[PDB]
Design a protein around this ligand. Structure first.
Ligand code: SF4
Ligand code: SF4
Ligand code: SF4
Ligand code: SF4
Ligand code: FES
Ligand SMILES: [Ca+2]
Lengths: 905, 588, 198
């Protein structure tokens, strides 16, 4: 299409509206109610331009650019005097009731309303009457509410209800008394409620966790990082001030997470700021805990390791690829053990084999929204891979999108699309041990044990393809439900099969692979998604190694007398008594970690490792994409006694001091080169980000904005002499403002979005190739493996149906977005959001045991009689006890296990 | 059409003359807010274009400025030739009362330009500074060495990839540079300084240092002496280099104003005026009449302050030590008024984008009237006691004399230019800030510029500034002290404190900075010591992409060897006293 | 409390030797000859303090020697440019004992507003400073106040009376900070004149 803006010719997409087309061209049109991910509704009336009928037209008329298609031969003017006057008048009308709040408002300096007030040129107030006022609501521990600042742009309700499918936020009242919030005080129930603080263009919805230690956007030190709280790999911009992690902002990745995070990623960062974190190397000498610097810690550890007869290393899926590789190089490949249990390792390696050998394409997180039917087997996605659940909700809305496209409705006219679609949706079928949060939009939900969910998957695969193994013993009603799923999946152009390792069942993953293979054999464009457990579960699976049980066996038999545990608490993957006994038997325990864990009491040496905020590295997400995270700040800048290094730096220096008796702190690119030289399956992590020599016209990439303040005073109380700028030899970023963050700079790692005149998250428009698309020079992160040419065979190991044995209680896993992840559950703001510990019981089982809801019952696992209160689960099948995985005292390895003597305390 | 509007100046006759001489495809005309025709010339035609401009019927006789620009990070270069770097040449025709800027585009690998020194001799130091700060070589330069940074300096600081902030101090490098200072005289060779035919074995080389601090600052002159006579001398400058232009790329448009104050530290609001006028051109702001009169009054008060220091220090340098005490008492009366108005003495930082920081306090007219009553008797007393003494006259008359041609070829401005009979003052030739509404005269010399004629011309300039101050006192308009423009930074404080849209504008202006749309602006003023100019390039951001400050003291110090050759050292110190320079102006 | 240059020690101070030390300190603090050294605009304010309207001669500190050998006080009045830092160090080394240093203005104190590639961030990076003056520039009476502060510091220091007999260490008094001394009167301020008047 061809448009003429202010007498200048432009080539645009005709299927776009004029606002997103002009913003993609670099032109500035003020806007409030439009969002790239939410569509156009034409509410705020801010985006007025003057449209002319033809070239020889001087009158024109004011139109909404967001509601006007960018059709071929379209003549508009942005800088027309009447259009500018009307846009200024719209800002002025918004300003009549706006509170005098910018100094005490958390949005200030990051506020889209401030930016558009300045952009329209409105700075003189002639309104003299009263301003309307609203009372605020309590919205829970994450979101702070201030309705005075609302401009009634309806972005919050459109995102929360129409996009995120939330139910507890709405708009109330009428005329100028419209109110946006909950129907009563309470916590916002959506797992994606935290995106309101970026969706809202004003300071109505703000980050309460950031508000506690508030600082302005210009004062932040930003880095591009990867969220560490699950396996999805959403791109984040952590921002630090005064040595503490202050905020997690969304970093736009047009391939993975685009505009949105989940609440665990956004608000679960508080473990970085915990005061009990190790900051120096500490050696246990008898009952004394002496503090070492880096060099003598390396020398003492190297001497003791040299005296040892066999050193084993226990990695973790929390640690990066480089850290796990450095531990593997320190101890040797045959002495390296993954820190996860044997069953978890089997499930993770099966998921990896399905992903990189199954011949079925695995989609990125944005690509999930383009699928026409979804079958989720076993994986409680909202509690384990939440952003996948949000993308699945978008894929469900795809049917209304297609129906509206059949009626020649433009794809941005979202209200017309929703009106045409009504309650029609693409088919979604979820299976779990109980109800999920996707049940509101799912075409069907199967509440069954993991064996029965696997049998349902195998039956679906057999009915799709007769070469798949059959299932004997399916009831006719379950058969009818299976047939419903089969005709929904067979008639889909793009079916998607989602599973993962969190169900605790190998057979669930096998059944999902069988369904995907059966759909691939019929010629469908089938995709498969595997949800892993942790941020680098897939990287640890690719690297490989022995299980934690084998490492504990080596420690117990005395074959290994030295153990180096990297970033692993070891209690989530094995019983605490066995771990404690094996670690007490070992004459040397060294723990390299950034969190004070329970195994540090028996540790002979503790190395103060860096968390993700203080370290660089690579993590492989659930789709196999290698992504680099960069260090946010120097931990030694304020506290000069802090010796907190990257885990790979500690382990490389330990290996060098063990070999040549000399220290070697090395560089990140050297470790990455060693990884890609030694492990060819991880060769793609080299191209996840450019090396430390990368420059934009000779200059590095700035971590902090150009208006960063307090350089000669932030450390003045410690010393009036300003310290040296922290040097970054590892990456291409600099720990200063003296660098490049231009939106036109040829790079893919953007620490934060800022453009002149766009101080809010709307500056990501300037950083994109087209608005709502990808980053201008490509989204960061590369895929490790391509889709294989040939697939796997059908898995013939169809399990038998679940049978409740008397006196034995099968543990059904229950996951929680707030509580199941280890580091995020250590965050203090999550404790209020955390559910109270519980045990779920069937009504028949609770009546048989003579217990009601709330009564405290006790059970013994690995010789630990623990007591929990009972709540009644309607959807749980009898013979099962529902336990909250990943919580304190309940390890995630308990999923699929069995319970004895479960009786009332 | 407002005076700040973007113009290509295609109606200028110089554009038609260049088109007739070189053809239409030889050059590219750029539309700017500089007020001058900006013409992009190919590198291979630069000397031809310069010679053609020098041989015009009303010729361009002065190279006003010559410097560089790192264009690699510039995103808004629409209509501009492809360029990693560029070199600009600002030339002035006084007879036409016109000026032209020539721009040469350069690729990153081919960073060399033909030298301009055969056409204009002040291009020597201008090209040395361009080589020092940008790394652009000039082929045919007689000695292209660093002039700001020391010779053992790595990198070119005005490049966009050079870090602006101070590096970590090291006592070892201080010890090493102290050793270089200690054996500098022992290993002195005239060849690296451009000197020649020294050690003949009759000349001596003698270094001057920081031993006579007459408020001008620290710099060195190495003199080649035949006995007592100067046969050659080069000034060693850069000892007062503050990186002010680099700081212009480091501060917002609003927060750079205190740095403008310290370019020529005896000038104050005089230094502030060209910067805020150039920013207001970028913003499209026309200030009201009260702002113009207030800014003129502050500029003339500081001009009298600077002239008082200059005249008294000249008298002290001649040998009469008494009038400096009384002249600094007069400076204190000026400071009484300036402290009352702006809150500060020497660096008020009081001008604003769109106006001034506050309204005039009640009772300013009383202090201005007191100073205007105090000054003339004191000035007459200084004249009779010192400037009419025949020993001072015998020390200053005929010392370091030059004519109009020497003043034009070296870029000499201010009283040194007007003592040669050329009537060129910016406040009359290119009026700014409402100076055309004031009745004042421009004193000019008889044709010959000595130390004495320069000093007496500055005395008459002081009297004319007193006349302007009297007019400012008698007719001060009623109205606003800030413009009614959205880019007035900051907005009026009372509306900021009670109106939300004004508070929003203030919030974003003081924190992120005012957004100046992408343009180039220029403002030239008659400063206290000559012609001072700001050339600002905005890339559409809240900071300057390029802040180029042309200062007259740079040109005067470069003129020093041509004027003092064949004289004695006493003539040199009297000449330095009569130049009216400060080293901050020279080195920026 | 005293600091020793040859550590934090106590007061080393017969009653005749104390009177001689007081007489020497009185003569030194009442005859302070500054070195005529001009770096930047702060030096303009210093020489303004030398003129008739301030008359720093009243304190006996107007002599303004051009040789570092005849000067007792170095006033770093201006920016410590990187090219000028060896010059400042050499001129300070050429001064003879006893010598005192006043860092004048924000540039000499810390680098001031010039956190830039060509400026040393404070003269105390390489030479010791007795009195610091904030300001950009400090007004001439601020320089006079710093001169009086230096006089108070000199009046209670301990230096050897002769280089052949006695302790040769230089003892400088650990004076109370001016901020802490003036905090009582400064915090008690309630109202100031409004800035709309002269
Ligand atoms: S929402 Fe924006 S405009 Fe309103 S008070 Fe907050 S920062 Fe100011
Ligand atoms: S609360 Fe925020 S997002 Fe919702 S209508 Fe008001 S300004 Fe818009
Ligand atoms: S979905 Fe996972 S990776 Fe993404 S923000 Fe949530 S916890 Fe982080
Ligand atoms: S502190 Fe201020 S007045 Fe003093 S030398 Fe530095 S810039 Fe000049
Ligand atoms: S953005 Fe178009 S009317 Fe709101
Ligand atoms: Ca690092």
């Amino acid at each position: 299409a061809t448009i003429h803006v202010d007498g200048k010719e432009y080539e645009v997409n005709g299927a776009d509206n004029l606002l997103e087309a002009c913003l993609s061209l670099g032109l500035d049109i003020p806007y409030f109610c439009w969002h790239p991910a939410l569509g156009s509704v034409g509410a705020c009336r801010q985006c007025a331009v003057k449209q002319y009928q033809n070239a020889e037209d001087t009158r024109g008329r004011l139109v909404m650019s967001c509601m006007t298609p960018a059709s071929d031969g379209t003549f508009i003017s942005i800088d027309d005097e009447e259009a500018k006057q009307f846009r200024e008048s719209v800002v002025e009308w918004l300003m009549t009731n706006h509170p005098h709040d910018c100094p005490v408002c958390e949005e200030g300096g990051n506020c889209h309303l401030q930016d558009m007030t300045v952009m329209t040129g409105h700075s003189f107030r002639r309104y003299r009457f009263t301003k309307r006022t609203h009372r605020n609501q309590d919205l829970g521990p994450f979101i702070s509410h201030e309705m005075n600042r609302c401009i009634a742009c309806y972005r919050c309700v459109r995102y929360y209800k129409d996009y995120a499918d939330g139910t507890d936020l709405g708009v109330y009242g009428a005329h100028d008394n419209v109110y946006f919030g909950r129907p009563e005080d309470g916590t916002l129930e959506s797992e994606f409620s935290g995106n309101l603080v970026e969706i809202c263009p004003t300071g109505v919805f703000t980050d309460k966790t950031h508000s506690e230690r508030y600082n302005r956007k210009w004062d932040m030190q930003f880095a591009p990082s990867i969220c560490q709280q699950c396996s999805i790999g959403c791109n984040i911009s952590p921002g630090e001030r005064y040595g503490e992690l202050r905020r997690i902002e969304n970093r736009y990745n047009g391939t993975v997470n685009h505009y949105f995070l989940c609440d665990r990623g956004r608000f679960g960062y508080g473990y970085v700021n915990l005061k009990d974190r190790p900051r120096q190397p500490v050696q246990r000498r008898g009952d004394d805990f002496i503090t070492l610097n880096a060099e003598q810690a390396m020398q003492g550890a190297a001497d003791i390791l040299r005296q040892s007869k066999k050193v084993i290393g226990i990695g973790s899926p929390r640690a990066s690829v480089e850290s796990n590789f450095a531990l593997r190089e320190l101890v040797g490949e045959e002495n390296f053990y993954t820190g996860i249990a044997h069953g978890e390792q089997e499930r993770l390696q099966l998921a990896l084999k399905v992903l990189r050998e199954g011949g079925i394409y695995t989609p990125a997180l944005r690509e999930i929204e383009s699928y026409d039917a979804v079958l989720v087997l076993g994986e409680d996605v909202t509690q384990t891979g939440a952003r996948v659940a949000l993308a699945v909700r978008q894929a469900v809305k795809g049917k209304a999108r297609e129906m509206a496209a059949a009626q020649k409705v433009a794809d941005w006219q979202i209200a017309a699309i929703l009106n045409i679609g009504q309650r029609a949706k693409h088919p979604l079928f979820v299976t779990n041990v109980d109800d999920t949060r996707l049940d509101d939009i799912a075409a069907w939900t199967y509440r069954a044990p993991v064996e029965d969910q696997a049998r349902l998957g195998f039956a679906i695969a057999h009915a799709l393809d007769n070469s798949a193994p059959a299932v004997d013993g399916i009831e006719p009603e379950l058969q009818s439900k299976i047939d419903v799923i089969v005709q929904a999946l067979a008639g889909a152009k793009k079916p998607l099969i989602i599973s993962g390792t969190n169900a605790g069942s190998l057979e669930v993953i096998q059944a999902a692979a069988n369904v995907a293979k059966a759909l691939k054999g019929r010629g469908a464009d089938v995709g498969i998604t595997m949800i892993a457990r942790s941020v680098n579960s897939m990287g640890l699976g690719i690297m490989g190694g022995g299980s934690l049980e084998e490492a504990l066996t080596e420690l117990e038999t005395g074959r290994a007398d030295a153990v180096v545990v990297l970033e692993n608490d070891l209690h989530r993957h094995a019983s605490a008594i066995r771990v404690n006994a094996a670690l007490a038997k070992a004459p040397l325990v060294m723990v390299v970690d950034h969190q004070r864990t329970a195994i540090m009491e028996n540790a002979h040496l503790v190395l103060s490792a860096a968390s993700f905020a203080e370290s660089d590295g690579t993590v492989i997400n659930n789709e196999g994409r290698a992504q680099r995270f960069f260090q946010v700040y120097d931990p030694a800048y304020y506290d000069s006694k802090t010796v907190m290094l990257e885990s790979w730096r500690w382990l490389h220096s330990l290996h060098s001091t063990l070999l040549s008796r000399e220290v070697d702190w090395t560089q990140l690119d050297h470790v990455i080169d060693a990884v890609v030289a030694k492990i060819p399956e991880l060769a793609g992590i080299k191209d996840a980000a450019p090396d430390a020599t990368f420059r934009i016209r000779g200059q590095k990439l700035a971590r902090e904005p150009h208006r960063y303040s307090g350089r000669t005073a932030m450390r003045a109380n410690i010393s009036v002499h300003e310290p040296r700028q922290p040097q970054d030899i590892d990456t291409m970023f600099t720990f200063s403002m003296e660098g490049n963050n231009q939106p036109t700079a040829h790079r893919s790692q953007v620490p934060f979005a800022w453009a002149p005149g766009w101080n809010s998250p709307q500056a990501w428009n300037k950083f994109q190739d087209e608005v709502g698309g990808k980053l201008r020079f490509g989204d960061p992160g590369v895929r490790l493996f391509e889709t294989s040419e040939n697939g796997l065979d059908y898995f013939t190991s169809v399990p038998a149906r679940f049978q409740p044995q008397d006196g034995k209680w099968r543990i059904a896993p229950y996951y929680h977005l707030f509580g199941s992840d280890e580091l995020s559950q250590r965050a203090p703001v999550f404790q209020s959001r955390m559910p109270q510990p519980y045990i779920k019981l069937n009504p028949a089982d609770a009546a048989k045991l003579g217990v009601n809801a709330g009564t405290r019952v006790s059970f013994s696992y690995d010789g630990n009689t623990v007591t929990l209160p009972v709540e009644i689960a309607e959807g749980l099948t009898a013979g099962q006890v529902g336990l909250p995985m990943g919580m304190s005292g309940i390890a995630p390895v308990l999923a699929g296990a069995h319970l004895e003597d479960l009786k009332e305390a | 059409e407002p005076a700040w509007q973007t113009r290509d100046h295609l109606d200028d006759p110089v554009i038609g003359e260049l088109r007739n001489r070189f053809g239409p495809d030889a050059f590219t005309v750029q539309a700017t807010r500089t007020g001058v025709p900006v013409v992009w010339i190919k590198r291979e035609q630069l000397l031809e274009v310069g010679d053609f401009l020098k041989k015009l019927p009303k010729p361009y006789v002065m190279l006003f400025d010559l410097h560089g620009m790192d264009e690699r990070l510039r995103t808004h270069r629409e209509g501009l030739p492809a360029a990693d770097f560029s070199v600009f040449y600002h030339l002035i025709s006084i007879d036409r009362n016109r000026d032209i800027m020539l721009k040469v585009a350069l690729a990153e690998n081919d960073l060399h330009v033909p030298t301009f020194t055969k056409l204009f001799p002040n291009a020597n130091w201008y090209e040395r500074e361009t080589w020092d700060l940008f790394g652009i070589t000039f082929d045919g330069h007689p000695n292209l060495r660093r002039i700001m940074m020391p010779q053992t300096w790595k990198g070119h600081p005005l490049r966009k990839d050079y870090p602006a902030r101070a590096t970590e101090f090291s006592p070892f490098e201080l010890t090493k540079a102290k050793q270089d200072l200690e054996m500098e005289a022992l290993t002195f060779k005239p060849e690296e300084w451009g000197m020649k035919r020294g050690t003949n074995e009759d000349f001596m080389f003698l270094n001057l240092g920081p031993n006579h601090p007459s408020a001008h600052g620290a710099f060195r002159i190495v003199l080649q002496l035949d006995g007592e006579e100067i046969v050659d001398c080069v000034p060693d400058i850069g000892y007062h280099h503050r990186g002010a232009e680099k700081m212009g790329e480091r501060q917002s448009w609003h927060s750079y104003i205190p740095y403008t104050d310290r370019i020529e530290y005896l000038g104050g609001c005089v230094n502030e005026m060209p910067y805020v006028l150039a920013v207001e051109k970028l913003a499209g702001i026309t200030v009201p009449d009260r702002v113009n009169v207030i800014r003129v009054m502050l500029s003339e008060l500081f001009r009298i302050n600077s002239h008082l220091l200059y005249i008294s220090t000249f008298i002290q340098d001649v040998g009469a030590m008494t009038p400096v005490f009384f002249a600094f008492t007069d400076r204190q009366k000026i400071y009484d008024l300036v402290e009352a108005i702006t809150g500060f003495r020497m660096h008020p930082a009081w001008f604003r984008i769109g106006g001034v920081a506050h309204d005039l306090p009640r009772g300013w007219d009383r202090l201005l009237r007191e100073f205007l009553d105090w000054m003339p008797k004191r000035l007459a007393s200084y004249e009779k006691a010192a400037l009419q003494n025949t020993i001072l006259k015998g020390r200053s008359q005929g010392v370091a004399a030059y004519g109009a041609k020497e003043a034009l070829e070296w870029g000499t401005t201010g009283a040194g230019l007007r003592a040669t009979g050329i009537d060129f003052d910016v406040r009359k030739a290119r009026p700014y800030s409402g100076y055309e509404n004031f009745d004042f005269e421009i004193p000019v010399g008889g044709g010959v510029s000595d130390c004495y004629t320069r000093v007496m011309l500055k005395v008459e300039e002081l009297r004319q500034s007193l006349r302007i101050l009297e007019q400012c006192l008698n007719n001060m308009p009623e109205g606003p002290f800030k413009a009614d423009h959205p880019l007035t930074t900051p907005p009026p404080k009372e509306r900021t404190l009670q109106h939300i849209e004004t508070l929003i504008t203030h919030f974003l202006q003081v924190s992120w900075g005012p957004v100046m749309p992408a343009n180039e602006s220029f403002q030239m003023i008659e400063a206290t010591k000559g012609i001072n100019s700001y050339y600002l390039t905005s890339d559409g951001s809240t900071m300057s992409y390029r802040t180029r400050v042309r200062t007259p003291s740079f040109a005067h110090l470069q003129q020093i060897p041509a004027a003092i050759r064949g004289s004695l050292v006493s003539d040199l110190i009297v000449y330095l006293g009569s130049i009216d320079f400060v080293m901050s102006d020279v080195d920026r | 409390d005293y600091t020793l240059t040859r550590e934090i020690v106590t007061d080393p101070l017969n009653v005749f030797m104390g009177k001689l030390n007081d007489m020497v300190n009185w003569g030194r603090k009442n005859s302070i000859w500054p070195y005529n050294f001009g770096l930047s605009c702060c030096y303009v304010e210093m020489v303004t303090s030398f003129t008739a309207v301030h008359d720093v001669a009243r304190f006996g500190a107007e002599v303004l020697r051009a040789s570092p050998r005849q000067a007792d006080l170095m006033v770093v009045a201006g920016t410590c440019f990187t090219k000028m830092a060896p010059v400042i160090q050499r001129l300070y080394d050429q001064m003879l004992e006893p010598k005192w240093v006043i860092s004048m203005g924000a540039c000499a104190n810390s680098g001031g507003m010039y956190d830039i590639y060509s400026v040393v961030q404070g003269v105390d990076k390489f030479i010791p400073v007795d009195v610091y003056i904030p300001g950009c520039p400090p007004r001439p009476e601020a320089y006079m106040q710093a001169l009086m502060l230096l006089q108070e510091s000199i009046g209670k220091e301990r230096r050897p009376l002769s280089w052949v007999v006695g302790d040769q260490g230089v003892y400088r008094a650990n004076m109370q900070s001016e901020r802490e001394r003036k905090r009582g009167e400064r915090i008690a301020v309630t109202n100031l004149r409004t800035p709309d008047e002269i």
